[PDB]
Each structure stands twice: as C-alpha cells, then as structure tokens.
Design a protein around this ligand. Structure first.
Ligand SMILES: CC1=C(/C=C/C(C)=C/C=C/C(C)=C/C=C/C=C(C)/C=C/C=C(C)/C=C/C2=C(C)C(=O)CCC2(C)C)C(C)(C)CCC1=O
Ligand SMILES: [Cl-]
Length: 314
C-alpha cells in the first residue's frame, strides 16, 4: 500500500505469460526483412482459422496519407520503408507512425497485408527462407495459445517506428459515446461483491471512461500486460480513451484479502475479448486490485496468464 512499484508484487503466485515479452525480445533481435517475413508468415497461417476485424473508418482516414505515400513508391522503396519501420529508423514516415495509437498502427498494417496479398505492395520475396533465429521465433509463436499469439503480433506492431521527443503529437481514434445506461450488462464474479471491482468492470464494458476514472486515487496506477504502471488520473484516462474502447471483460471468479493499513487486495480471473477478434479469441486474464480504505483503486494490474491452468480453481 506504500508505493505503486511495490504493489506490483501482490499475488506473486500469479503465473503471467512471460513467454510473450520473451518472444518479442527474440523477434526484436532479427534482421528487419526477417521480422517482416516472419509476421507475414504468421499472419497468413493465423488467417486460415481467425479473421481480423476491419479497421474503423476514422482510423483508416488517419493512416490514409501514409498508406498512399507507400503505395506510390516503387517496389524497392516500399520494401525499404517497411524495413525502416521494423528497424525503428528516424524517418518522417517512422515519426508519423510513432505518433499513432496502437489501433491506427494495426489498421495501417491490416491495409498493407491486404495490398501485399493483392500484389499492389511489394510482397515478401517469393520462396523467402527465414534465418535460423527467425524460424525458431515463428515456431514458438505458432505453439502459443491464440490470445498469446495476437498479443505478440500487437506488440511487434506497436514497437515499430521512431519516437523523437517526450510531448510529441498523439493521434488516436475519436472517443465512442458511452453505452446508454438502459442497455448496459452487469458482470457477476464468483466470490466478489466488491462494488469498486464490479463498477470497474461494468464501466469499462460500457466505454464509460469518465465514470471509470473516478474509481481511482489521484496517484493511482493501472498496469497493462507486460507494461509499466500508468500513473495518475490524467495518464490513466488518456490510456482508456486511446486504447481501451470496445473491449469485453468476462470476469469469472475472484478472491478478497486484507492488505497493510486498511487496504484490500482482490484477484479476479476470467477472459477478455478485443474488438479486433470479437468472440473468436478469449484471452486468459487476471486483474490484481489494491484498494485503499475508502474503496478507491490505488493500483490495478492486468496480467495475461500463462495458461488456462492459471485461472482460479480450473
Ligand atoms: C506487421 C506486419 C503485417 C501485419 C500485421 C497485422 C495486420 C497484425 C494485426 C494484429 C492484431 C489486429 C492484433 C490485435 C491484438 C489485440 C490485443 C492483444 C488486445 C488485447 C487487449 C487487452 C488484453 C486489454 C485488456 C485491458 C483490460 C482487461 C483492463 O481491465 C484495462 C484495460 C486493458 C487494455 C489493460 C504484415 C502481415 C503486413 C506483414 C509485415 C508486418 O510486419
Ligand atoms: Cl483492443
């Protein structure tokens, strides 16, 4: 209950899927052309059984100029531009890309994937063979659960490009209006009646970010899977609005324990769906809450779990 960084240690039994950042670190070592080929390979195979949802119209508008610029290049330049993004080179295209929210980056690559499939953007060279390190990285990816697979792909996409400056322009999709109160569903969590946890889940499922943020302490933090804590209401609300639209949280069961100084620690396990895959991918998730004596959220961590065997009382 003293520091955000120490609260990171609550529920230390929770086995997170650290194969995801491990695999991202291996991927990030590879030659840029192998990075592009590997994801092409993974994308094609995954597309045999899982269809990515189409990017939103606003997103496509925001990426359109950059996409047109690439589409106007000769093939060798197209390949160089994509390598620039993978290498995190400092170029105008890489700076534009870095200014984008994850969803806009994902929609940019969604479009390039379609154009490569159609032959209008320089495809991976025919008969391309991955490097020794890259073939093993792909093998690991293809052995993971789909929820882990899609998280590796997102993290590879978000990592590309070049950030120059701390207070650089941030481009994101417009904020969706919250769900009308009448049509809202309420979660049920075995073992957990805590109103702050239930209101957390219900407000996020309704895209009601202004209500959600009011659950937090001023200095409170939210820790997304495999990322550092996002600290204080402005940064956490920013994150909700830019990155947390149209999720479906399906918490199942939890446990509630006292913590030092009248705090309460609560662990919930369940599933989450991203709007990119809808009901076809259910990620296995834990939430770890540290609530102050008044019930506000001092800290919440969201963990991608190593296996369904990490869900409480499987
Ligand atoms: C790149 C590339 C390509 C294309 C690649 C493409 C098109 C790849 C596309 C990949 C896509 C669309 C991946 C989407 C992933 C989404 C995830 C993991 C969302 C998780 C959300 C969670 C867990 C949120 C949970 C949350 C909960 C519960 C909270 O309680 C609080 C909020 C929080 C957010 C934390 C080509 C194919 C063209 C080849 C070349 C190449 O490189
Ligand atoms: Cl998402």
């Amino acid at each position: 209950p003293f520091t955000i960084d120490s609260a990171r240690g609550i529920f230390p039994n929770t086995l997170a899927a650290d194969v995801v950042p491990a695999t991202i670190a291996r991927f990030s070592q590879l030659n840029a052309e192998d990075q592009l080929a590997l994801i092409w390979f993974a994308y094609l195979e995954m597309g045999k059984t899982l269809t990515i949802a189409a990017p939103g119209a606003a997103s496509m508008q925001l990426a359109e100029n950059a996409l047109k610029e690439i589409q106007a290049m000769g093939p060798l330049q197209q390949t160089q531009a994509m390598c620039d993004l993978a290498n995190r080179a400092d170029t105008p295209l890489c700076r534009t890309y870095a200014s984008w929210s994850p969803n806009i980056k994902l929609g940019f690559w969604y479009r390039l994937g379609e154009l490569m499939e159609q032959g209008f953007v320089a495809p991976i060279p025919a008969g391309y063979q991955l490097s020794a390190n890259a073939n093993a990285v792909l093998a690991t990816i293809q052995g993971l659960e789909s929820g882990q697979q899609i998280t590796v792909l997102r993290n590879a996409v978000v990592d590309m490009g070049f950030t120059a400056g701390k207070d650089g322009k941030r481009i994101a999709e417009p904020v969706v209006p919250p769900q009308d109160t009448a049509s809202r569903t309420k979660v049920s969590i075995e073992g957990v009646t805590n109103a702050t946890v239930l209101n957390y889940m219900d407000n996020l499922n309704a895209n009601d970010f202004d209500t959600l943020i009011e659950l937090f302490t001023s200095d409170g933090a939210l820790q997304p899977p495999f990322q550092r804590p996002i600290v204080g209401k402005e940064n956490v609300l920013r994150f909700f609005r830019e990155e947390c639209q149209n999720l479906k949280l399906i918490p199942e069961r939890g446990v509630t324990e006292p913590a030092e100084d009248g705090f309460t620690q609560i662990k919930v396990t369940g599933k989450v769906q991203t709007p990119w895959f809808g009901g076809n991918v259910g990620m296995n998730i834990a939430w770890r809450f540290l609530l102050n004596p008044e019930g506000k959220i001092f800290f919440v961590a969201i963990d991608l779990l190593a296996s369904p065997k990490e869900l409480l009382n499987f």
